Amino acid sequence: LVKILVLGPSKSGKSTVTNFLAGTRETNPLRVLEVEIALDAVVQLWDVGGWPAIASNADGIIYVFNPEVKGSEKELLLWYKNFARVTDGHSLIFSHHSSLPEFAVGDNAIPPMPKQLQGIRALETSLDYQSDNFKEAFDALVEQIIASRLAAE
Ligand SMILES: Nc1nc2c(ncn2[C@@H]2O[C@H](COP(=O)(O)OP(=O)(O)OP(=O)(O)O)[C@@H](O)[C@H]2O)c(=O)[nH]1
Ligand SMILES: [Ca+2]
Ligand SMILES: [Mg+2]
């Protein structure tokens, strides 16, 4: 199995980003959706509502935030702090247009992140608004998780 944590400030869209990825098409403490992807074991997404048993055995993290909302960028460092040397940089950050883009647009439709977070691959994300093909980053993320393990031997 592979367990990928979905963390992010409240109302950011981490639930909305989740069911799209797990195939199926308001807040809640935790919602684990099951799906499986095959290219070239199981994939379970743990949408956390905006913990220490949650962080356990975690293999990757997807941060989701609203780029219109001020201070969100530094709120991820806590989700980075808490759920985190648990993860390495396998993390993914979604600059998620939940609203018609006003501020995100332009020279950072993915705004500047903290130094620890930057250097983690970032994407412009939204289901209706301008976005990046982030199902591909997911597929590519799942593949990068499994391969590492028995590669070491
Ligand atoms: N138009 C539009 N609205 C979106 C989009 N994604 C999220 N939203 C807005 O955000 C709401 C859904 O976001 P959620 O997934 O519930 O937010 P969350 O990250 O789960 O945050 P919590 O409340 O803590 O669970 C909807 O009411 C939408 O209005 C989107 O792609 N397009
Ligand atoms: Ca696009
Ligand atoms: Mg949610």
13 annotated as a binding-site residue = yes
Q: Facing residues of 93 across strands?
A: 63, 122
Sheet of strand 92-96: strand arrangement: 30-35, 43-48, 2-7, 60-65, 92-96, 122-125
Torsion of the alpha carbons at 124, 20, 87 and 73, rounded to the nearest 10: 40
110 C-alpha to ligand 1 centroid (Å): 18
CA distances to 72, 108, 128 from 124, rounded to whole Å, are 15, 9, 12
Q: Which ligand is nearest to the CA of 130?
A: 2
Question: 3-state DSSP call for residue 36?
Answer: coil
Interatomic CA distance for residues 105 and 68, integer angstroms? 10
48 annotated as a binding-site residue = yes
Q: Which ligand is nearest to the CA of 64?
A: 1
Q: How was this structure determined?
A: X-ray
Contact in structure between 65 and 96 (CB atoms under 8 Å):
yes
Residues within a 6 A CB radius of ligand 1 = 8, 10-16, 26-27, 49-50, 64, 98, 126-128
150 C-alpha to ligand 3 centroid (Å): 33
16: part of which helix (H) or strand (E)? helix 14-21
Interatomic CA distance for residues 133 and 75, integer angstroms? 25
Instruction: Please report the resolution in angstroms.
Output: 2.3
116 C-alpha to ligand 1 centroid (Å): 26
| Ligand 1 atom with the shortest distance to the CA of 100 | 1
Interatomic CA distance for residues 21 and 146, integer angstroms? 18
Q: Which ligand is nearest to the CA of 133?
A: 2
